[PDB]
Amino acid sequence: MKNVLMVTTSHDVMGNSNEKTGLWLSELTHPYYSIIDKNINIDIVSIMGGEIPIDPNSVAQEDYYNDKFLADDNLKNIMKNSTSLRDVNIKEYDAIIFAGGHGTMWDFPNNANIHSKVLDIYAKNGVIGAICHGVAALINVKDNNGQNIIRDKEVTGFSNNEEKIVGLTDVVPFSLEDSLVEAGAKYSSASEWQSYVKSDSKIITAQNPQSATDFAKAIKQSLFN
């Protein structure tokens, strides 16, 4: 039996504007249904617990798995009454997966529980996954010498190009791409909205919502030896 922890943002406002944001729903639901089976359990948490905010742009278009997820009474109640990351015991899990959405830019980078729990998974060579802006979770994760664990590792994440296309370069609190480079990672990206997944030392990163399928595939494979 494998046990996977998926983590979402709790942040629901786009910076100093009144625009709503949060989780990019399919980055939770598509990897959820791609990975789950009778031998792989998935638990979901958010940073703060309680209601998981959904970026409305992520549900503007109808989507089969988003609807499936929201129609399941159990999963609906997770979205309303989620457990906080601070309340789970990371020892129980074989992998930790960070979903995206712009909300992550405001509550992932400096979260102490993200830092300590990613270290725990990393130390037993478990799988660490992050997609889109969710890769913000990994920027500041440091070992006991204060060195970033993603230094010298090949990663991707939501690109500056994509950020410019959606018009939020000046709304986000920092450039994700630039921050990964500053952290010492080897950042790369594919062309905009193309599926792109990197895997280095069981740290698996993915660029955009269009990468969710291959992201999940990579995670599921890495769970096994």
The CATH number of residue 139's host domain is 3.40.50.880
Phi first, then psi: give them for residue 204, nearest 5 degrees: -115, 120
Cβ atoms of residues 53 and 13 within 8 Å: no
The answer to whether residue 133 is catalytic is: yes
The answer to whether residue 163 is catalytic is: yes
Q: Tokens 């994700």 map to which residue? A: 176
Total number of domains in the chain: 1
In angstroms, the CA 17 to CA 181 distance is 27
Q: What is the DSSP letter of 43?
A: E
In angstroms, the CA 207 to CA 214 distance is 11
What is the domain range of residue 204?
1-225
Resolution in A: 1.5
The residues near 147 (Cβ < 8 Å, ≥ 6 apart) are: none
The catalytic residue among 30, 102, 162, 163 is 163
In angstroms, the CA 199 to CA 128 distance is 10
The catalytic residue among 11, 27, 102, 132 is 132
The catalytic residue among 133, 162, 177, 192 is 133
In 3D space, the residue among 116, 104, 119, 73 whose CA is nearest the CA of residue 7 turns out to be 104
In 3D space, the residue among 186, 168, 55 whose CA is nearest the CA of residue 177 turns out to be 186
The residues near 112 (Cβ < 8 Å, ≥ 6 apart) are: none
